[PDB]
Amino acid sequence: MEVKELERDKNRVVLEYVFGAEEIAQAEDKAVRYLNQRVEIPGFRKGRIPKNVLKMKLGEEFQEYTLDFLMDLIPDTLKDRKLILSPIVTERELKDVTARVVVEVHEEP
């Protein structure tokens, strides 16, 4: 969880929080949990739905939840700062794992 200051308009700042991997795990987990006590899935016991299920039967919604939990860590960061109004959240996004590789090919003619 490393934050980086973008712009500063006198007393109006705009910080950028970027969360680690493990951090997303826990956040994910808080989600998985938070949901189990709120939704029901045809084929599973109450509060027993696996993450693979939710993650696939929730679509980008589960992704939002995971982010929500990641937000909580924020408050506990501005403790030393003397604030006026509660910090707003301009934007946010969760980028899933991804791999890339380019290759060079030669054809006939």
From Swiss-Prot:
Source organism superkingdom: Bacteria
Q: Which residues form a coiled coil?
A: none
Q: Where in the cell is it found?
A: Cytoplasm
Free-text comment about domains: Consists of 3 domains; the N-terminus binds the ribosome, the middle domain has PPIase activity, while the C-terminus has intrinsic chaperone activity on its own.
Summarize the protein's role: Involved in protein export. Acts as a chaperone by maintaining the newly synthesized protein in an open conformation. Functions as a peptidyl-prolyl cis-trans isomerase.
- State the similarity comment: Belongs to the FKBP-type PPIase family. Tig subfamily.
From the Swiss-Prot or TrEMBL record, give the protein name.
Answer: Trigger factor
What gene name is given for the protein in this entry? Answer: tig
- Report the portion of the entire protein shown: 1 to 109 of 425
